Amino acid sequence: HVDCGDNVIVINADKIVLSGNKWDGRIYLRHTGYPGGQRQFTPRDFMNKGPEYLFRKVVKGMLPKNRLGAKIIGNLYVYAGTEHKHEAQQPRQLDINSLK
Amino acid sequence: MIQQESRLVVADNSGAKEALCIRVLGGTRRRYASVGDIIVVSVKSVIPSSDIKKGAVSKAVIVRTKKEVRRPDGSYIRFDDNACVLLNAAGDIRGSRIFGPVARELRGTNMKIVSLAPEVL
Amino acid sequence: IGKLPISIPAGVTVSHKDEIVTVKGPKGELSQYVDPRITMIHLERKTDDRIERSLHGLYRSLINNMVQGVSAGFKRELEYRASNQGQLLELSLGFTKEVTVETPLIILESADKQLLGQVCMKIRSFRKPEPYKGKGVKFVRKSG
Amino acid sequence: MKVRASVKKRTPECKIVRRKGRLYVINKKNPKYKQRQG
Amino acid sequence: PGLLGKKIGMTSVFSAEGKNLPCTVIEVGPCVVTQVKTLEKDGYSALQLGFVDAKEKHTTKPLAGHFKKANVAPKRHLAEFKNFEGEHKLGDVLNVEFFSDADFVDVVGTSKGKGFQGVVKRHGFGGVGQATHGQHNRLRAPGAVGACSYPAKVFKGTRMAGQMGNERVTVQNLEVIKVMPEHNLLLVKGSVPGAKGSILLIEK
Amino acid sequence: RTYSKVIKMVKSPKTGAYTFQEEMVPNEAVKDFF
RNA sequence: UCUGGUAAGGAUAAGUGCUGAAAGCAUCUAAGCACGAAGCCGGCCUCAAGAUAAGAUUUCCAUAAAGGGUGGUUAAAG
RNA sequence: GUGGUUUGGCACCUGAUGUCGGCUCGUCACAUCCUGGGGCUGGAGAAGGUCCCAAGGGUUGGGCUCGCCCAUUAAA
RNA sequence: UAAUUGCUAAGUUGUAAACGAAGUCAAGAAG
Ligand SMILES: [K+]
Ligand SMILES: [K+]
Ligand SMILES: [Mg+2]
Ligand SMILES: [Mg+2]
Ligand SMILES: [Mg+2]
Ligand SMILES: [Mg+2]
Ligand SMILES: [Mg+2]
Ligand SMILES: [Mg+2]
Ligand code: NA
């Protein structure tokens, strides 16, 4: 019941990999709330809009669906390159392959 | 401004006296016909010993309108009646004389033989 | 097919570099993009699987086509008027680099077989042969 | 082109191909034998 | 690119070939450049133009400082225009001669306000039934507003009574009859939105 | 019959293949196109 | 009474093709590449930062008239 | 085999789930009437016929009460 | 995000048939 996790900065986010034909074959559906208002989009459309939008869409969905999850998703920072400005926080480098 | 069920004078020397507009030709939901427009009519009254029979469905061209017609030069013309001229299947005058004036717009309606008219206004 | 040697003739030199392998010869310089699974010219298929075999045969055929294109080149002849000066849109049948054309018949010569085929197909797409009567662009029927 | 659930090469000259997940029968000599939807 | 204007009224004139042309008179007036927006600072290129001369009595201190920086007399109406061929600086003046080589213009205005309007005037509803033949009290009613329990809701976008007019409207491709620089006048064929004295945007 | 079809080959901007671009032009105006 | 709806910028459907193996042939396809619809995403018009991811730019900064409110004369605004 | 749109079978919900057509206002599907693109034709051309893709927008007014008739329309 | 060995390339999957083509992997028989 407490926000007790880390603040995560993801770098090199445009080099993420999707296997199979999921870059264009995975169909995301949404609705505008108007009649005849279902719309389609793809992970490619998300990535063209920006890596952070695709990453946020995926991580939400794996987070809890409540107020705590809505706050927790705000601790994720996603960047295409290696250039981010988070000095004076001294983020430590975590090897993602070490976590199991 | 002639629509379905409007009654017109027949302004030629054919047998018909009065006609009833059945349909305004030219498109879906086309409401009104003016001078130079082609309509379908039913003949309502004829003279005794008339070539055309009462109840005959025919085509006609409108030559006089009570509602006023606007010309591009800022002028307007209106008549005291609503008058048409009957046509055959080929699109030509059924008769040989025209009674009363006709609108000047009929010159450009490929209807030049209505130059039988006493006066073109 | 994909295992036969590909002899390089005199005047044509083929260099392999960074999967952008280019053959520069007498009649032009052509390029190709072999795969890691693919390796005179001697092909070498790493595995015997279906994908490896198909890729090996395809790449060997492409290399041989490149060698023939640089060395001897290719020509196609096709059968309303025609033109000689403006080789973009100058033919009259109805109304309204890297290749050479001749002056009705047309002879078109080049070094890239795919480009030559595309250009010939586009030239012949203007008027296909008519089954009703023999008419239209043809390479050098039924009663109605 | 004819669409049916059962395609067969009724003639030696007919050939069976697969294109983008569909099955076609092609015949250049006479194109009225062409079928699809294997 | 374009300029701010004021609608004067309508008249009808005669062309050279003898055609009665309806005509709207617009005072396009000298517009002064009051701000240059750039990609480096603002993120997009545009020019801000001011139209009608104001007074210090009706200029607030922030806007007074804005005009002081532009080094122009205070203006009443400000609007932004993009895709200006030719460079323009702070304080430059543009007049109705800007339209001296245009055959057609676009006019943006605010339409006349109708207030709250029913479905018949607002959306052209046909009305329920006839005036007679058993009519009780639904002559200008909307009729049904949905289907039965299966949707069990009124859809979004259902046409209903409400505020009509008093909104931004664009009229496209109005032919230009004459440019009159001596009076800052523009004559267009046809009608433009709004009442007399309303402020218009005229785009080339 | 002054109009005429004009198709010109040009390298692709995203692939690099000699694609075709076609337009109608006047008979005298073909010089500007090609 | 004026004005508008066109065309197809991009990716495609059914189809048309280039080169080409598996399968020395063939094959529009498995590697690549051209095309190809009123359909799809745009372009056009209106709204739109409570877009709580609450954005940007210019200018001014407390008391009189920095900004407002209440009030008055009113409006093609309601 | 599919659908549930016809005639049925069952009797599971119901101290009221209250009524056929027409009007008004719609909304969706595509099993496509028109308009757009294609394959085959026993397709000379022109008319067509059948099949495939395609749901954007359109898809009349009358004399009679599912249907018939009159006059249209790109289509009804 | 265990260990080992296969199969699938269809996102099949992680919760319908007569009839086609045999896409792929094995196990064979005749020739
Ligand atoms: K509901
Ligand atoms: K389940
Ligand atoms: Mg008002
Ligand atoms: Mg009424
Ligand atoms: Mg009553
Ligand atoms: Mg009443
Ligand atoms: Mg029982
Ligand atoms: Mg009860
Ligand atoms: Na599935």
Whether nucleic acid strand I comes within 7 Å of the CB of D38, the answer is yes
C-alpha of E129 from chain center: 38
Residues of E in contact with B74 (CB under 8 A): 12, 14, 19-20
The residue of F10, F18, F24 whose CB has the most chain C CBs within 10 angstroms, and thus the best one to mutate to test that interface, is F18
- The CA-atom distances, in angstroms, between E73 and each of E3, E32, E46, E49 are 18, 9, 21, 12
Which of E11, E6, E57, E9 shows the shortest CA–CA distance to E29? E6
**In Å, what is the separation between the CA of B19 and the C1' of H68?**
27
Rounded to the nearest angstrom, the minimum Cα separation between A29 and chain E is 19
Taking a 5 Å cut-off on Cβ, the residues next to ion ligand 4 are E 127
Q: How far apart are CA A7 and CA D4, in angstroms?
A: 59
Which method was it determined by? cryo-EM
Q: How far apart are CA C65 and CA C27, in angstroms?
A: 13
Largest CA distance in chain B: 45
Search chain E and give the residue with CA nearest B73.
E19
Q: Strands E93-94, E185-189: parallel, antiparallel or unpaired by DSSP?
A: unpaired
Q: Strands B83-87, B7-10: parallel, antiparallel or unpaired by DSSP?
A: parallel
CB contact under 8 A, F1 and C95: yes
Whether nucleic acid strand I comes within 7 Å of the CB of A61, the answer is no
Q: How far apart are CA D35 and CA D19, in angstroms?
A: 12
Q: How far apart are CA E14 and CA A91, in angstroms?
A: 78
**CB-CB contact of C87 with F6 (8 Å):** no
Query: Which other chains touch chain B, taking contact as 3+ CB pairs less than 8 Å apart?
Result: E
> Which amino acid residue lies closest to nucleotide H50, measuring CA to C1'?
D2
Q: How far is the CA of E132 from the centre of ligand 5 (A)?
A: 9
Question: Which positions of strand H lie within 7 Å of protein CB atoms?
Answer: 22-29, 38-45, 51-52, 56, 59-61, 70-76
Q: How far is the CA of B108 from the centre of ligand 8 (A)?
A: 75
**CB-CB contact of E30 with E5 (8 Å):** no
How many Å from the N-terminal Cα to the C-terminal Cα in chain D?
13
Taking a 5 Å cut-off on Cβ, the residues next to ion ligand 3 are E 113
CA angle B53–B57–B61, rounded 5-degree value = 105
For the CA atoms of chain E, what is the radius of gyration?
23
Q: Which residues are registered as beta bridge partners of E189?
A: E23
- Beta-carbon neighbour count of residue E163 at 10 Å? 12
The DSSP result for A28-78, as a single string, is EEEE-SSTT-EEEE-HHHHHHH-HHHHHHHHHTTTS-SSHHHHHHGGGEEE
For the CA atoms of chain B, what is the radius of gyration?
13
**CB-CB contact of E188 with E177 (8 Å):** yes
Whether residue C98 lies within 8 A of chain F, CB to CB, comes out as yes
Which of A86, A99, C114, E100 shows the shortest CA–CA distance to F18? C114
Residues of E in contact with A33 (CB under 8 A): 156
Q: How far is the CA of A21 from the centre of ligand 9 (A)?
A: 15
Identify the contact set of chain E against chain B, taking CB-CB distances under 8 A.
12, 14, 18-20
Q: Give strand letter and number of the nucleotide nearest A99 (CA to C1').
A: I1
**CB-CB contact of B102 with B114 (8 Å):** yes
Whether nucleic acid strand G comes within 7 Å of the CB of E121, the answer is no
**CB-CB contact of E113 with E194 (8 Å):** no
Whether residue A5 lies within 8 A of chain E, CB to CB, comes out as no
Whether residue E155 lies within 8 A of chain A, CB to CB, comes out as yes
The total number of residues written for chain C in this structure: 144
CA angle E164–E168–E173, rounded 5-degree value = 120
Residues of B in contact with E21 (CB under 8 A): none
Whether nucleic acid strand I comes within 7 Å of the CB of A19, the answer is yes
The DSSP result for B54-89, as a single string, is TT-EEEEEEEE-SS-EE-TTS-EE--SS-EEEEE-T
Q: What are the two backbone dihedrals, phi and then psi, of residue F11, each rounded to the nearest 5 degrees?
A: -65, 145
Q: Give strand letter and number of the nucleotide nearest B25 (CA to C1').
A: H72
- Beta-carbon neighbour count of residue E59 at 10 Å? 18
**In Å, what is the separation between the CA of C137 and the C1' of H47?**
27
Q: How far is the CA of A39 from the centre of ligand 1 (A)?
A: 20
Percent helix, strand, coil in chain F, to 5, is 10, 55, 35
Residues of E in contact with A35 (CB under 8 A): 155-157
Q: How far apart are CA E70 and CA E154, in angstroms?
A: 53
Whether nucleic acid strand G comes within 7 Å of the CB of D19, the answer is yes
Residue type, E9: G
Q: Is the alpha carbon torsion for A63, A65, A70, A72 positive or negative?
A: negative
Residues of C in contact with F34 (CB under 8 A): 86, 88-89
* Cβ-nearest to F34 among C86, C95, C115: C86
**In Å, what is the separation between the CA of C57 and the C1' of G30?**
12
What resolution in angstroms, rounded to 1 decimal?
2.7
Question: Which positions of strand I lie within 7 Å of protein CB atoms?
Answer: 1-2, 9-11, 17-25
Q: Which helix (H) or strand (E) holds C122?
A: helix C113-124
Q: A23 by DSSP, 3-state: which? A: helix
- DSSP secondary structure letter of residue E63: H
Residues of A in contact with E146 (CB under 8 A): none
